[PDB]
Design a protein around this ligand. Structure first.
Ligand SMILES: CCCCCCCCCCCCCCCCCC(=O)OC[C@H](CO[C@@H]1O[C@H](CO[C@H]2O[C@H](CO)[C@H](O)[C@H](O)[C@H]2O)[C@H](O)[C@H](O)[C@H]1O)OC(=O)CCCCCCCCCCCCCCCCC
Ligand SMILES: CCCCCCCCCCCCCCCCCC(=O)OC[C@H](CO[C@@H]1O[C@H](CO[C@H]2O[C@H](CO)[C@H](O)[C@H](O)[C@H]2O)[C@H](O)[C@H](O)[C@H]1O)OC(=O)CCCCCCCCCCCCCCCCC
Ligand code: CLA
Ligand code: CLA
Ligand code: CLA
Ligand code: CLA
Ligand code: CLA
Ligand SMILES: CCCCCCCCCCCCCCCCCC(=O)OC[C@H](CO[C@@H]1O[C@H](CO)[C@H](O)[C@H](O)[C@H]1O)OC(=O)CCCCCCCCCCCCCCCCC
Ligand SMILES: CC1=C(/C=C/C(C)=C/C=C/C(C)=C/C=C/C=C(C)/C=C/C=C(C)/C=C/C2=C(C)CCCC2(C)C)C(C)(C)CCC1
Ligand SMILES: CC1=C(/C=C/C(C)=C/C=C/C(C)=C/C=C/C=C(C)/C=C/C=C(C)/C=C/C2=C(C)CCCC2(C)C)C(C)(C)CCC1
Ligand SMILES: CCCCCCCCCCCCO[C@@H]1O[C@H](CO)[C@@H](O[C@H]2O[C@H](CO)[C@@H](O)[C@H](O)[C@H]2O)[C@H](O)[C@H]1O
Ligand code: OEX
Ligand SMILES: [Ca+2]
Ligand SMILES: [Cl-]
Ligand SMILES: [Cl-]
Lengths: 32, 334, 36, 450, 37, 243, 30, 31, 56, 39, 31
């Protein structure tokens, strides 16, 4: 089916969201 | 000044050969009570109807036990979790027959060990130490509380508390495995790691320190006389011990900071024991070890055995024989 | 039994009262460091 | 406030200790964590709703939040059958959205808001030594907790009532009209022995007592809130206690450990605030049910269960408790204190009544006993139900087991945390939390022990 | 289950509750990016 | 008893007490010459236990010795149903039918010997003398009752020897396994004699109360040892259905 | 009579404890 | 109980022989 | 040094230690009484005071 | 109260000849009484 | 021969206890 596929897409977007925030702050020079 | 202040100064005095303290004012009476009753009961208590089926079990030396087989027998299954002090028995003989000594000893012992842990904190405070030896002590206390209080509570009877005896301990363990598969419980696995690793690290640390002792003696006298009580100079060469160990495994796996090393020595067994205490405490609520019985099926659907199935066979063998007269109905729920 | 019950109750109450009133008796000041 | 070891004295693994004196940053951390809590509530509720088969009992489906909502009287009717799935969904949604708001506020305070609040406002600024301000915050929060208790009371009285498993005609959502304000009962609950047959407050067995105790709790909490707003700690309290942020944390940790232990016991034993309709049988209930199931079966087969002696000479099906009551035989003798709505119609003044056992047992009671016996809170860590020697085909672990185990573990580790922080708070107040000062090592001025 | 209008995002509700685990992980990620100062 | 609830009774011991009628009670229950009347909730509360100690000398009086109960308030028969049939001459015949008509009881004797026994009224048939046209203070039902083995045939001894289950030998000693007399379990059916002296009759409510004395054997532990003689003295209550 | 032997060894152990505590070698700083 | 007939003497000697060894060594120490 | 048969003369002029050794002797004698009674109790046959009295 | 060294303490001695004499005495007493101990 | 069951232990202790007394005293002499 597609339930694991959709589930994994949501999970991966979530997994990236946090590290993406940290990486953007580190690269653009925001306070950390 | 006042009589009360003088008493306070006495109880909290760091000059007493044995520190008393406020926690000590509870520890000492309860621990002495538990000890006196334990000695008397282990030597001379009459048999106890542990299973509540009028099948008394002889625990004391005078009734034919040796030291290995002797025990203070847990109170009757008929009592369950009811409070059974001496004054609730019509006679001392009745109290003994139903296992009252077990309850007396256990309750006083548990109060005493919690007060012992409080007393450790108290004395460290009086001596200006850091306060966390009692935290390390909370691991054995947690395990003791699990086996004497929490498990009987979850199971609904002090009859299911660990007996106060050697063979009784083994019986407790075997039945616990039969009913909960503690070996296949990860918290017990962590406890095993805790104790195996604690012994490993004890041996390792002791051996590295002993290996790196600074020469201060001759080959005739004990090297122990090389250390004088109250010296600041270090009695061993930690840098040589680090050189050895970092070459035994590799450099970055060896501690060179004694403080971090000793923190690790404290933390490893303590955490392992906390985890195994929590394992026993949660199997008290029958959240058991892993069950992989018939996990592997062949393509047709026949079960292929694994070592878990062999273990389950052993567990069933233990289970069907335990408390052979106590069960009336097909499922061992209680 | 009732004599035993009363006696044990008295003993336990006295020990608990000792412990409580001791820890109420300005215990934080009974240390070798600071007294504020 | 610094954000590294040289300027704070705390390593990264103790980095939150750096917040002890940054009141605004600490408020941000607290609000963000509250957001995490509310988020989990909402997300877990939505997950459970999504994974809910509304005609299969809740306890068979790994649900711990939906039973809480059902017990409150939302979405359930007689025998606990799920009428409307939408209230569960609304509770979950509301928590999720407010969690978003709480997280935003916590992030603002932790990351951009003022570092400390004391030079911005006297009302929200606090100092741990400010005994008056600390008791003010206790007072505000005591008022709020009293409001929450009265919210439960209002739901039970005027907003549809709560689920009463003891309801005549069958357990059902009913409106509590006569809560017991009688202080004798309410506060004698607190005086009952924490042992078998008494069950200190775990034994509360009727929604009237629960609601009346909550009315009392609301009044006590609100009056204590006002008391602490308008007063400062007395001399005895000032002399006995440590007055510092870590000390207050340690006190709360002790409190939390106590509450966690109590909740684990509560869910393990109590079937009133935790109806077996939603949480499944207690272990005691399941054992009693097995005894009842086989009494009924053997009686239908022709066994004279009154006079049948078992192998040991005690009655197979019936026996006496040590106080004389007529109880189920077998190992379940330990569980004779059990009371449940399916078993009490057969209990007489002396315990189990032979006449009711012989001609009053209903088919629904037989069905309930079978269900409860087969959902005994026994199970493996990988969720294989039954006794541990059973095989893999029954995927069940009681919600009571999950809740009791988790809360016992959390209670213990919070006792450990209390010990850690109480010891540290004492040592820091006395000024030796960083080690023994070599110059003034206290033991060196102490006489030798012998 | 979820009421009918919402079962397009069933696979998102399936993963929502584990998010606080990721926050706990993110604390360590942030500390790793700052070199665990 | 009285008129309270299980909540008032629980953990008091009252559940083990046989109900009592009254004080101003000297009634009588008239009985038809040849009809049988059901007895509804017959209760027997033991109070005194004596064990006939066995002297080693010979030929000498054994002297029943008072024992003390180690089991708790678990010693009473109750909810017993039976019947009373009135003979052709006038005799009264009490017949126990069922109920909670047995309790295992263990008494301690001076000297530390523990005596379990199966205190019961099972299948008790008792009779009065002829010429009874009523149940009154002179009604003495003297009769017999059966005493099943204390341990059932499903019991396993500590070496898992039993009658219809378990080993028939001492497996822990393979070369002496068949050497032990206790390898053979028995459950003989013993005999007891009971007497129910009616002392107080409330004929309106049908309640009779009185004293009882019973004589029976003790546990033999599956025939391991010889049965002692246990005498039990106590009180009894019941309701006689007149209609 | 083996009970006497068990009691003897247990008493010996406890007596050793009491002396090791009460009559210990003082730790001395020098 | 029918115990091993050498039990008491074995136990007594097992304890007594090392006890007296230690006692001798301790008492003569400092000579 | 002292011959073996004279060791106890060390408390001859030490009233405190003379009291001490008298106390220890009294403790030993009282402990013997207690333990002897306990032993006799552990083996006494009380059933037949006629043909098996205590002095038998 | 203080713990003062007791000045009444004296060494004890058993010379080698005394050792041999005592050991012989003990051995011959054992020889004498063992038969009666066995009876 | 059916000898007194306490004979061996009594004989062993009768010899051993004074033997060890003498041994202790002798060995520590000169301390
Ligand atoms: C500082 C303060 C310290 C205070 C110390 C005072 C003692 C504290 C501990 C009490 C020990 C109780 C032991 C027996 C518990 C028990 O019989 O059972 C549990 C009881 C509840 O009792 C039960 O309560 C039940 C109530 O249910 C009844 O009523 C229900 C109503 O729905 C149902 O109808 C049910 O069927 C019916 O039976 C029944 O009465 C049972 O018979 C009865 O046993 O819990 C209770 O009352 C009390 C809650 C116990 C908490 C668990 C212990 C915490 C341990 C921590 C260990 C930490 C270690 C750390 C080391 C480092
Ligand atoms: C050195 C190295 C050692 C390390 C090795 C690797 C370790 C990593 C860390 C742990 C990893 C967790 C495993 C995740 C998989 C999982 O868990 O898998 C389980 C589930 C997901 O799997 C589902 O698990 C379900 C579990 O049963 C539940 O659902 C069933 C069907 O509805 C029944 O209703 C049943 O009653 C109910 O319990 C079913 O088996 C489903 O078929 C299955 O798909 O994840 C969940 O539940 C989510 C669980 C999160 C919350 C758990 C709370 C636990 C509470 C208290 C703990 C107390 C004591 C702990 C003791 C130890
Ligand atoms: C306990 C939680 C808490 C506490 C103590 C504070 C405290 C503070 N906040 Mg903050 N905040 C929070 C949560 C909290 N906040 C949350 C969850 C958000 C996201 C919406 C914010 C977003 C926020 C912003 C953007 C700002 C603050 C500011 C402030 C400071 C000024 C307060 C003020 O005078 O405004 C006035 C107070 C009022 C007008 C009272 C209104 C009360 C609320 C909003 C109405 C609802 C009341 C409710 C019924 C009570 C119970 C709540 C219920 C959920 C149980 C102050 C120290 C300001 C600041 O730092 O100044 C420099 C500021 O810039 N906060
Ligand atoms: C979370 C809520 C909360 C918190 C943190 C506090 C905190 C405090 N209160 Mg309190 N209080 C509250 C709610 C709260 N209160 C409510 C709702 C009321 C209304 C009834 C009160 C009414 C009140 C009064 C009248 C007083 C306080 C006082 C105090 C201060 C010292 C009291 C103390 O030492 O504690 C611990 C208690 C003791 C050290 C006394 C010993 C108590 C017994 C011996 C403990 C035994 C408990 C037992 C083991 C547990 C079993 C459970 C149950 C069976 C009892 C302290 C800062 C005192 C103060 O400083 O006044 C301003 C004070 O006199 N409060
Ligand atoms: C409300 C509860 C509470 C609060 C507010 C605090 C707050 C604090 N604690 Mg504390 N503590 C608590 C409970 C609490 N603690 C409990 C219950 C324990 C017993 C275990 C402790 C034991 C403790 C110790 C030993 C120390 C503190 C310290 C501190 C200070 C810094 C800690 C820090 O930076 O965290 C940083 C966070 C981490 C390093 C991550 C820890 C991860 C844990 C170990 C595992 C998480 C397991 C969890 C169940 C999830 C499982 C994951 C699974 C999926 C694999 C801080 C003020 C420090 C201190 O004393 O400061 C002065 C310190 O040394 N605490
Ligand atoms: C009180 C807390 C609690 C309880 C009682 C439950 C109970 C349950 N959950 Mg749940 N959950 C929780 C919190 C809880 N959860 C949290 C915080 C999350 C967010 C991650 C979730 C997300 C979640 C999902 C997605 C699912 C569940 C499911 C379930 C059910 C199956 C349980 C299972 O097999 O897990 C397995 C057991 C383990 C994996 C063992 C966990 C052991 C931890 C690591 C113990 C930590 C030890 C200690 C605290 C370490 C710190 C100490 C330190 C000092 C060293 C069950 C009723 C399942 C279900 O059936 O849904 C309907 C399901 O699919 N939960
Ligand atoms: C109250 C009774 C009593 C007391 C207090 C004393 C006290 C003393 N006697 Mg003396 N004595 C007594 C009765 C007593 N005696 C009797 C009844 C006899 C005749 C048998 C003697 C004959 C005697 C002699 C010849 C000498 C003494 C000496 C001494 C002094 C040193 C003792 C010593 O160190 O030996 C230590 C003894 C040992 C190290 C081992 C002795 C082992 C014995 C033989 C067996 C022990 C068996 C058992 C433990 C004792 C139970 C017996 C009990 C029921 C009485 C001391 C002041 C000596 C002296 O005068 O010093 C200057 C000395 O030479 N006594
Ligand atoms: C922040 C603020 C957040 C919101 C605060 C409270 C809002 C809740 C209002 C809902 C009231 C129900 C309206 C419809 C109605 O009457 O009942 C309609 C239905 C069914 O409810 C029925 O109401 C009837 C009204 O008389 C009767 O009482 C019936 O007995 C009852 O069944 O209710 C629902 O489906 C709603 C469920 C209630 C859930 C609300 C609690 C969760 C919200 C707070 C949590 C967030 C906290 C953040 C931190
Ligand atoms: C500060 C800090 C931190 C913390 C943080 C936190 C703690 C947080 C949080 C937060 C939060 C707490 C959040 C949140 C959120 C939420 C959201 C964002 C939401 C939403 C929504 C939605 C979108 C929904 C939707 C839906 C609906 C409507 C219903 C149906 C289903 C669904 C799901 C679809 C850390 C540690 C990192 C570190 C650094 C510092
Ligand atoms: C709702 C409810 C109810 C009710 C309840 C109530 C009413 C309650 C309460 C309660 C309370 C009212 C409580 C309490 C508590 C207390 C505590 C918990 C305490 C304490 C203590 C402490 C902690 C102290 C300490 C100390 C000491 C000891 C001394 C020194 C100082 C110090 C401080 C350290 C009922 C059951 C009916 C039903 C159910 C529901
Ligand atoms: C497959 C290959 C192996 C995979 C390896 C995965 C594990 C690797 C280590 C995980 C990362 C640890 O992260 C490591 O933390 C240390 C703390 O000592 C920090 O160390 C670094 O900090 C900062 C980076 O901002 C630098 O200025 C500094 O000079 C450097 O020491 C870094 O944050 C990173 O180097
Ligand atoms: O008691 Mn001792 O162990 Ca706990 O599981 Mn049910 O009960 Mn009895 O049978 Mn298996
Ligand atoms: Ca889904
Ligand atoms: Cl067993
Ligand atoms: Cl059973």
């Amino acid at each position: 089916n597609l339930e694991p596929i959709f589930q994994l897409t949501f999970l991966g977007l979530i997994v990236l969201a946090g590290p993406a925030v940290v990486f953007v702050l580190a690269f653009r020079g925001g306070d950390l | 000044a006042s009589l009360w202040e003088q008493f306070c100064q006495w109880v909290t005095s760091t000059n007493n050969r044995i520190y008393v303290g406020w926690f000590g004012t509870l520890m000492i009476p309860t621990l002495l009570t538990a000890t006196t009753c334990f000695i008397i009961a282990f030597i001379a208590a009459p048999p106890v109807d542990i299973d509540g089926i009028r099948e008394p079990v002889a625990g004391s030396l005078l009734y034919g036990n040796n030291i290995i087989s002797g025990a203070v027998v847990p109170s009757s299954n008929a009592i369950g979790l009811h409070f059974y002090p001496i004054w609730e028995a019509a006679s001392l003989d009745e109290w003994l027959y139903n296992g009252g000594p077990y309850q007396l000893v256990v309750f006083h012992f548990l109060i005493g060990i919690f007060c012992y842990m409080g007393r450790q904190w108290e004395l460290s405070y009086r001596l200006g130490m850091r306060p966390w030896i009692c935290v390390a002590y909370s691991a054995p206390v947690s395990a003791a509380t699990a086996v004497f209080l929490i498990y009987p509570i979850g199971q609904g009877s002090f009859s299911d508390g660990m007996p106060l005896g050697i063979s009784g301990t083994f019986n407790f363990m075997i039945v616990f495995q039969a009913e909960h598969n503690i070996l296949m419980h990860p918290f017990h696995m962590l406890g095993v790691a805790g104790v195996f690793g604690g012994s490993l690290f004890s041996a390792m640390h002791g051996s590295l320190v002993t290996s790196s002792l600074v020469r201060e003696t001759t080959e005739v006298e004990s090297q122990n006389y090389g250390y004088k009580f109250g010296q600041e100079e270090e009695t061993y060469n930690i840098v040589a011990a680090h050189g050895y160990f970092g070459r035994l495994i590799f450099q970055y796996a060896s501690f060179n900071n004694s403080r971090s090393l000793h923190f690790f020595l404290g933390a490893w067994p303590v955490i392992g024991i906390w985890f195994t205490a929590m394992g026993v405490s949660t199997m008290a609520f029958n959240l058991n070890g892993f069950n992989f019985n018939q996990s592997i099926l062949d393509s047709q659907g026949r079960v292929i055995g694994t070592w878990a199935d062999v273990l389950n066979r052993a567990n069933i063998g233990f289970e069907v024989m335990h408390e052979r007269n106590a069960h009336n109905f097909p499922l061992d729920l209680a | 039994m009732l004599t035993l019950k009363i006696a044990v109750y008295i003993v336990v109450g006295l020990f608990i009262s000792l412990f409580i009133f001791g820890f109420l008796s300005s215990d934080p000041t009974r240390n070798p460091g600071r007294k504020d | 406030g610094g954000r590294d070891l040289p300027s704070t004295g705390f390593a990264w693994w103790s980095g939150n200790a750096r917040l002890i004196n940054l009141s605004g940053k600490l408020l941000g951390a607290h609000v963000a964590h509250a957001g995490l809590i509310v988020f989990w509530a909402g997300a877990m509720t939505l997950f459970e709703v999504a994974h809910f088969i509304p005609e299969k009992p809740m306890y068979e489906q790994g649900l711990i939040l939906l039973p809480h909502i059902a017990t409150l009287g939302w979405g359930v009717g007689p025998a606990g059958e799920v009428t409307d799935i939408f209230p569960f969904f609304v509770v979950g949604v509301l928590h999720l959205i407010s969690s978003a708001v709480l997280g935003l506020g916590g992030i603002y305070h932790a990351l951009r808001g003022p570092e400390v609040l004391e030079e911005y406002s006297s009302f929200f600024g606090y100092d741990w030594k400010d005994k008056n301000q600390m008791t003010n915050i206790i007072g505000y929060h005591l008022i709020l907790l009293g409001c929450g208790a009265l919210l439960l009371v209002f739901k039970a009285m005027f907003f549809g009532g709560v689920y009463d498993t003891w309801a005549p005609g069958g357990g059902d959502v009913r409106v509590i009209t006569n809560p017991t304000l009688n202080p004798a009962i309410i506060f004698g609950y607190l005086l009952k022995a924490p042992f078998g047959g008494e069950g200190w407050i775990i034994s509360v067995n009727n929604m009237e007592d629960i609601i009346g105790g909550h009315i009392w709790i609301g009044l006590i909490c609100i009056s204590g809130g006002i008391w602490h707003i308008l007063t400062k700690p007395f001399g005895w309290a000032r002399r006995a206690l440590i007055w510092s942020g870590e000390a207050y944390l340690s006190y709360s940790l002790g409190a939390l450990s106590l509450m966690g232990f109590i909740a684990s016991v509560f869910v393990w034993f109590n079937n009133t605030a935790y109806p077996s309709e939603f949480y499944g049988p207690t272990g005691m209930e399941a054992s009693q049910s097995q005894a009842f199931t086989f009494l009924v079966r053997d009686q239908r087969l022709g066994a004279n269960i009154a006079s049948a002696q078992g192998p040991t000479g005690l009655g197979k099906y019936l026996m006496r408790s040590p106080s004389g009551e007529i109880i189920f035989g077998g190992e379940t003798m330990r569980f004779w204190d059990f009371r449940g709505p399916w078993l009490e119609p057969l209990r007489g003044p002396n315990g189990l009544d032979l006449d009711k056992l012989r001609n009053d047992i209903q088919p629904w009671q037989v069905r309930r006993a079978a269900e409860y016996m087969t959902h005994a809170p026994l199970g493996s860590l990988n969720s294989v139900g039954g006794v541990i020697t059973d095989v893999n085909s029954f995927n069940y672990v009681s919600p009571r087991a999950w809740l009791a185990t988790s809360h016992f573990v959390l209670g213990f580790f919070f006792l450990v945390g209390h010990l850690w922080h109480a010891g540290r708070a004492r040592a820091a107040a006395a000024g030796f939390e960083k080690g023994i000062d070599r110059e003034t090592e206290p033991t060196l001025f102490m006489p030798d022990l012998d | 289950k979820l009421p009918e209008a919402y079962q397009i995002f069933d696979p998102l509700v399936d993963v929502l509750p584990v998010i606080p685990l990721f926050f706990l992980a993110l604390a360590f990620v942030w500390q790793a990016a700052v070199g665990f100062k | 008893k009285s008129q309270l609830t299980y909540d008032d009774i629980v953990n008091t011991g009252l559940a083990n007490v046989c109900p009592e009628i009254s004080s101003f009670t000297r009634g009588t229950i008239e009985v038809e010459p040849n009809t049988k009347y059901f007895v509804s909730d017959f209760c027997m509360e033991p109070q005194e236990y004596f064990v006939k100690e066995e002297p080693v000398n010979k030929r000498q009086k054994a002297e029943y010795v008072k024992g003390k109960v180690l089991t708790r308030q678990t010693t009473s028969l109750e909810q017993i149903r039976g019947s009373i049939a009135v003979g052709a001459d006038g005799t009264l015949t009490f017949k126990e039918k069922d109920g909670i008509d047995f309790q295992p009881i263990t008494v301690l004797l001076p000297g530390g010997e523990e005596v379990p026994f199966f205190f019961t009224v099972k299948n008790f048939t008792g009779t009065t003398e002829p010429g009874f046209t009523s149940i009154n203070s002179s009604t003495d039902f003297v009769g017999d009752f059966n005493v099943p083995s204390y341990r059932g045939a499903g019991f396993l001894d500590p070496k898992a020897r039993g009658l219809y289950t378990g080993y028939d030998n001492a497996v822990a000693l393979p070369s002496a396994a068949d050497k032990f007399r206790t390898n053979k379990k028995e459950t003989p059916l013993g005999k007891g004699t009971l007497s129910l002296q009616v002392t107080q009759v409330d004929g309106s409510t049908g309640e009779i109360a009185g004293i009882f004395e019973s004589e029976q054997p003790s546990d033999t532990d599956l025939g391991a040892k010889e049965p002692l003689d246990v005498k039990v003295r106590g009180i009894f209550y019941g309701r006689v259905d007149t209609d | 009579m083996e009970s006497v032997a068990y009691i003897l060894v247990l008493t010996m152990a406890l007596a050793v404890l009491f002396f090791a505590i009460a009559f210990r070698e003082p730790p001395r700083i020098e | 109980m029918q115990v091993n007939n050498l039990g008491f003497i074995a136990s007594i000697l097992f304890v007594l022989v090392p006890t007296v060894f230690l006692l001798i060594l301790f008492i003569q120490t400092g000579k | 040094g002292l011959p073996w048969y004279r060791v106890h003369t060390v408390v001859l002029n030490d009233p405190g230690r003379l009291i001490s050794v008298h106390l220890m002797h009294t403790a030993l004698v009282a402990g013997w009484a207690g333990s002897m009674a306990l032993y006799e109790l552990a083996i006494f046959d009380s059933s037949d005071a006629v043909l098996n009295p205590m002095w038998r | 109260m203080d713990r003062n060294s007791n000045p009444n303490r004296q060494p004890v001695e058993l010379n080698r000849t005394s050792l041999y004499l005592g050991l012989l005495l003990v051995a011959v007493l054992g020889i004498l009484f063992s038969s009666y101990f066995f009876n």
